[PDB]
Amino acid sequence: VTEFLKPRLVDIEQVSSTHAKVTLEPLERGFGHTLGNALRRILLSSMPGCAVTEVEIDGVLHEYSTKEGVQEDILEILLNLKGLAVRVQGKDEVILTLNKSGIGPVTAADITHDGDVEIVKPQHVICHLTDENASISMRIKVQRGRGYVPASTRIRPIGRLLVDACYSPVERIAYNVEAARVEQRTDLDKLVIEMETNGTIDPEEAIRRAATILAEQLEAFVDL
Amino acid sequence: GVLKIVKVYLAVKRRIQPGDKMAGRHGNKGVISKINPIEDMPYDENGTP
Structure with a gap:
């Protein structure tokens, strides 16, 4: 309680030349949708x-x-x-x-x-x-x-x-939250971002870019 | 009364604005009203807005 697991990148699966999937894990309850939606809006x-x-x-x-x-x-x-x-x-x-x-x-x-x-x-x-x-x-x-x-x-x-x-670069972004299996815990999520770019952008680079832009623009609230 | 006439042809590309009037084929005319960015439009679970 009063402490949160931090996410991570587990695997960047390259299903095709221009179609990719990114997996983020673990996520506490109620963050699946929040991060999924924020990242979708940023990336698009x-x-x-x-x-x-x-x-x-x-x-x-x-x-x-x-x-x-x-x-x-x-x-x-x-x-x-x-x-x-x-x-x-x-x-x-x-x-x-x-x-x-x-x-x-x-x-x-x-x-x-x-x-x-x-x-x-x-x-x-x-x-x-x-x-x-x-x-x-x-x-x-x-x-x-x-x-x-x-x-x-x-x-x-x-x-x-x-x-x-x-x-x-991006053209279509979808995502899904689904329960995962950590050593032992319930209500532990896992985010999957499905990306269909036009081929000019590396997935991991894109997701890191979105994360950094969101964070460094959110910085304007702390120490306001 | 005229000595010489000069004609010039301009080509323009009217693109689209809030205010144009696009309609279907069943008499359901309407005045386009906003141009939302793509990230705000409804999207089905597959991801296509």
């Missing part, structure tokens, strides 16, 4: 992600035109690009370059990747070149952000196209 709310912001195609002036050789318009290219998954190690703002010529799909794998930038899904499609001598060269801009940022509300030449940012 603010995780630092990376996303494409500006595109600069060679022979296009604005996104509403079309280019000869490609199948889709420029709008669909921007849309497909908006969902690109990529991680950057050190730099907070990087520039990738894509060059392609010849018939076929243009996967993300054709990006001239640098040493640090890493593409997570090298089979993601971008466009279909339908001519033996139709080429596309573009310069993608990737930034680091913390949520949603529409093109309108941010803050030069006529060659830049602006896409909307969606910096958020």
Whole structure:
């Protein structure tokens, strides 16, 4: 009585490439739901992600035109690009370059990747070149952000196209509380966080990030 | 009376605001009223809000 068991991370099971499960144990009664809900809100709310912001195609002036050789318009290219998954190690703002010529799909794998930038899904499609001598060269801009940022509300030449940012690795978070079996005790819980990210964020890192943000923002109540 | 006319075409992307009027197919019109962050919406036990 008047003393509480402290939680811990028991195992980070990686069920698939982008689907993960985290187990927290033990938890006193009445904390299962509290921590589950707090962590769900934090994780869905603010995780630092990376996303494409500006595109600069060679022979296009604005996104509403079309280019000869490609199948889709420029709008669909921007849309497909908006969902690109990529991680950057050190730099907070990087520039990738894509060059392609010849018939076929243009996967993300054709990006001239640098040493640090890493593409997570090298089979993601971008466009279909339908001519033996139709080429596309573009310069993608990737930034680091913390949520949603529409093109309108941010803050030069006529060659830049602006896409909307969606910096958020997590996509769906669920959780379950279930009784566990410590050496001997009743009403001792165990929390299971099921996570479905887009592949750009390591689970344990994400959960530690949520814990630290919550705690260091809760610090404003002690010694008020 | 006119010497020359110049026409310019603007393209705009009206996105969505609290105030638009979206409706179903069975005459259940309604004025959208707020844009809640995803973490506040009801979610079933599977996790899909």
